[PDB]
């Protein structure tokens, strides 16, 4: 049921989650945004996995641009037409010059990437910590073993 | 034992949610992450965890694979990927900054002193940087 009203409604509740008109949202805040959304564009409340799969790009730090969210929500409901891809590019230029605030043009991270990094990181911290316990344990027992022998 | 979290992982590689993982879905996820697999490579990957010759992978087979990796083998191939991820700029060395930045991420609040000891014991060469060889040695045994 895509319509004229939905687009004003997406741009409306943007002020609810961003009154300051930053055009960027903290990734953690995003999940609730899409939950409290218009019926066609809405994504069901358990939506962390979808957000991850969407790969919305995030600028430093953990800030996703207004448009990326928008087009990704539409091209979820709608097919990925060439015109949309072209349309967003034209819109991007309009938004940047329009924005009074100035920031770097490119963001180096996306949600999919971020999730792999968090996974890979846990694995390393988990391993590092376990390796440490073993060394301590080995050192304590050996010390006790030699001391007892003495 | 709790399988609560492994379902999230299965969902990531299932785009349509048909309860199975094809080559194409798996390849899609790899490419997005920064790696190009050959078409043949995707097939072999699928085969290893493919018990019933189906050619795709549902939660049983996926669960078995997770269980097999449950032991903390910490294989070099698994580690190699982590290095690739943390080496943000691709120069073959992990600078302190890169690793230090990883600590901020949620997995564990490694203290700055703990992170410094990680770098001290790993940087054999003595050039403020972890290469692949030092990183592997640090994480092996
Ligand atoms: Ca599937
Ligand atoms: Ca199968
Ligand atoms: Ca580097
Ligand atoms: Ca070095």
Numbering used by the authors:
A (entry chain A): 1611 to 1760
B (entry chain B): 7 to 147
Give the article text.
Voltage-gated Na+ channels (NaVs) rapidly activate upon membrane depolarization to allow passage of Na+ ions into cells. CaM is a small (148 residue) ubiquitous eukaryotic Ca2+-sensing regulatory protein.
The crystal structure of NaV1.4 CTerm Short (residues 1599–1754) in complex with (Ca2+)4–CaM was determined to a resolution of 3.30 Å (Rwork/Rfree = 24.0/28.5). Crystals belong to the space group P43212 and contain one complex in the ASU. Unlike in the complex with the apo–CaM, in this complex the C-lobe does not form any salt bridges with the NaV1.4 CTerm although two residues in the CaM lobe linker are involved in salt bridges: Asp78 and Asp80, both with Arg1740. The N-lobe of Ca2+-CaM is found in an open configuration, in contact with the Nav EFL, with a shifted center of mass (3.6 Å shift) and with a reduced BSA relative to the apo CaM N-lobe EFL interface (334 vs. 495 Å2).
